[PDB]
Design a protein around this ligand. Sequence first.
Ligand code: HEM
Ligand code: HEM
Ligand code: HEM
Ligand code: HEM
Lengths: 146, 146, 138, 138
Amino acid sequence: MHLTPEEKSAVTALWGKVNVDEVGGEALGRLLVVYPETQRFFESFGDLSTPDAVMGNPKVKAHGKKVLGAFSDGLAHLDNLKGTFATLSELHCDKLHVDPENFRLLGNVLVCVLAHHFGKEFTPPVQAAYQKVVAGVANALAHKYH
Amino acid sequence: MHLTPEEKSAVTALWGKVNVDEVGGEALGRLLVVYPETQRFFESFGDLSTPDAVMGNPKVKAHGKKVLGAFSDGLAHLDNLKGTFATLSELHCDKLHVDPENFRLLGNVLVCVLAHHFGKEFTPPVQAAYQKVVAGVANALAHKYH
Amino acid sequence: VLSPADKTNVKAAWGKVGAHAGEYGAEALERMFLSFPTTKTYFPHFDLSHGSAQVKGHGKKVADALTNAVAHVDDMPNALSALSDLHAHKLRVDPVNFKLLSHCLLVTLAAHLPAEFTPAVHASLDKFLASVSTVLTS
Amino acid sequence: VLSPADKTNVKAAWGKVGAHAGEYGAEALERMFLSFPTTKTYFPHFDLSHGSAQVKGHGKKVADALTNAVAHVDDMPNALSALSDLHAHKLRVDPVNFKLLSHCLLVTLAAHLPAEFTPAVHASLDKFLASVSTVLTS
Ligand code: HEM
Ligand code: HEM
Ligand code: HEM
Ligand code: HEM
């Protein structure tokens, strides 16, 4: 992961203003509404039939916070993404059977949500930096698939 | 390049039996026939109007051999494909303006050409080892796009 | 497919874009070039610097094409015909690149339309951009 | 899209496959599973070991559906509808995987039908597999 010093600054700077609880909720929620194929992994979450059922679902909000906290771990270890996500990778592969293409969908829904929340502040150069990070996290989540 | 030693051994052994003149002309020839969109980068090679025109085109055959030459060079460099293909990467990016998505197309046509020439000896395991080589080469060529 | 609800969402969202469409198209292209550098290979004869007028000029054309697609939401394949011949047969733009531009438009719209970019509308726009991409690539 | 000459190339090659279709579908599966391990995530209830019986049995099913597609090359959407609802709405297979299976099928054919696998025929089969994928993912 080729992250220059400026990109890292920009990224980190940015993350420090993120309310993780909420952004996670929104991110996971929009993933299930915009790309309904990813609902097949969460049948135990109950009602997912409309946008309001999804976005306000308490199990969706709790899971989203969980995903985003892990995402948080990654940003604290940008120079060792593979090590940090190694056990999560094996989990998503061996136990959950998630096609890694789904990791890219989520990565991009997150970029959209950061842009939604920060508007102006989310400039092109800042988006470019976050796109490297989400690609990095998706590649690291994918590495132990076998 | 995560290749098991029995994988490297599998790749090397088959490669030593490869007739570069034939395979190289066939791989490049099939790229342009099977994926005509790639014809836009070789207007200078001449008449590419029909399959028969493409497969007998002496410029197509000669350039194929050069491309396999570069691929042999990576095979003997599997530990540093990045360094091995850097200049070639900059050329494909700054001088010829080739979308790196096209590298995959050539890699797969090449795998289809090996299977066509080796038949039963191109077993699933050998194929898998070569898919890894071919991805790594694609990635190496893309690395310096800026 | 675009459902009725989807069409409504799209009309209402592009509606609110109004006169700022050209600038959004322009921002969307800059976002794409910076975040996904391989896309620049299709524009080697452009000046791709920040503020470039060639880029502003091009952003405007992309947005007009999208406006027209919305105006003819029930016959997009025929309304976008000329643009499909250009992209798929003259330029030969690889389909993945459409996904990258679409994503960049969504980011632009989100960054500028806080109150209208709800989950439902986001799903609708995404579907519309996919439909535009399928047409342009076919 | 599929031309008459493509249709022609595909019937002949496929008719050469003859009674090996089954054997070929299974081989193409095993090539896919070893070369592209992420595809195994859609088959967690299968024994995926070498030469195992679900894979073989499954190989027959894939190869027969292609037999049927060829026979109905002119109206695939209709002939395949049921497989389309299965892969698109029930299984929700991400499209990327279709390109991976198609490649493996091409590799297999080329490995077994050397004389029939000419460039023109490689070109038509590749357009054929892409059309089937399009039907099965829309
Ligand atoms: C940034 C990417 C992702 C990260 C960091 C992440 C993180 C996590 C974490 C921390 C868990 C809890 C693990 C455990 O239960 O011990 C989890 C579980 C899960 N993940 Fe992911 N995940 C990601 C993407 C996805 C995606 C894209 C999918 C599918 C679309 C997915 C499907 C699941 C499922 C189904 C569970 C278990 C849910 C349950 O408790 O029933 N994950 N993920
Ligand atoms: C991924 C495997 C590929 C490799 C290893 C490769 C490598 C090369 C090499 C060694 C040369 C000759 C450099 C020289 O003589 O100075 C070359 C030239 C070139 N390559 Fe590639 N290339 C690859 C794929 C492609 C792709 C897929 C295309 C376009 C579809 C492409 C487009 C070109 C063009 C237009 C030239 C100049 C040819 C000419 O002299 O007109 N390359 N490349
Ligand atoms: C939303 C999808 C897209 C739409 C609606 C669109 C629309 C347009 C329009 C209106 C033109 C100008 C037509 C003219 O001046 O005659 C154009 C040209 C062009 N487009 Fe697209 N485009 C899209 C996606 C893409 C993508 C993904 C690429 C490549 C990454 C691309 C590359 C080009 C190029 C190279 C030209 C010619 C530019 C020039 O030489 O002036 N477009 N497009
Ligand atoms: C040429 C493309 C393909 C064709 C023609 C095809 C055909 C079929 C057929 C005939 C079935 C059995 C349906 C039945 O029982 O009535 C099936 C099932 C299935 N396909 Fe495909 N398929 C294709 C591609 C794919 C790919 C790309 C994937 C994902 C890697 C996939 C995953 C599955 C799975 C998981 C099943 C269910 C297996 C089971 O539950 O027993 N298929 N397909």
